[PDB]
Amino acid sequence: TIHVGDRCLCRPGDRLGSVRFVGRVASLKPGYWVGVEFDEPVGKGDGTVKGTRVFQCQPNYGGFLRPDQVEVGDFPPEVF
């Protein structure tokens, strides 16, 4: 299970980020979605869907992914 605040690596390409949203979003496709804020500007979006905000996020840092694309783990930003 995926919770808001979780750290993650996301497909494709092991994109590092934080889970900002988990839930259904009708204006996308049916089923559950995970809103991710990436550390780097590798997101397809900015946390909105056709303009409507779902989670706070800046342009190029936001993605909505299916849960199968999200690996929750201990992935803190590298600092040392």
Author numbering: 153 to 232
Question: What text comes from the article?
Answer:
Five tubulin-binding cofactors (TBCs) are implicated in late-stage tubulin folding and heterodimer assembly 1,5–10. TBC-B and TBC-E are implicated in binding α-tubulin, whereas TBC-A and TBC-D interact with β-tubulin. TBC-B comprises an N-terminal ubiquitin-like (Ubl) domain and a C-terminal cytoskeleton-associated protein with glycine-rich segment (CAP-Gly) domain.
Crystals of the CAP-Gly domain of TbTBC-B were obtained from a construct producing the 81 C-terminal amino acids. The crystals are orthorhombic with space group P212121, with two polypeptides, labelled A and B, in the asymmetric unit. The TbTBC-B CAP-Gly domain is a small globular structure with a similar fold to other CAP-Gly domains, and is an important module for the recognition and binding of the C-terminal tail of α-tubulin 17–18. The fold is dominated by five β-strands, β5–β9, forming a consecutive twisted antiparallel sheet with β9 returning to lie in an antiparallel fashion at the other side of β5. The side of strand β8 forms the floor of a solvent-exposed, primarily basic groove, which is flanked by the two extended loops, linking β6 and β7, and β7 and β8. The TbTBC-B CAP-Gly domain has a different sequence in this tubulin-binding motif at residues 195–199, GKGDG. Glycine rather than asparagine occupies the third position, and this nonconservative change precludes the formation of a side chain hydrogen bond with the terminal residue of an EE[Y/F] peptide. However, and fortuitously, in our structure the C-terminus of chain A forms intermolecular contacts with the basic groove of a symmetry-related chain B. The C-terminus of TbTBC-B has the sequence EVF, which is similar to the α-tubulin tail EE[Y/F] motif, and so these intermolecular interactions can be taken to mimic the association with a relevant binding partner. The peptide-binding groove on chain A is occupied by two formate molecules, derived from the crystallization mixture, which bind in similar fashion to the negatively charged moieties of the C-terminal peptide just discussed (data not shown).
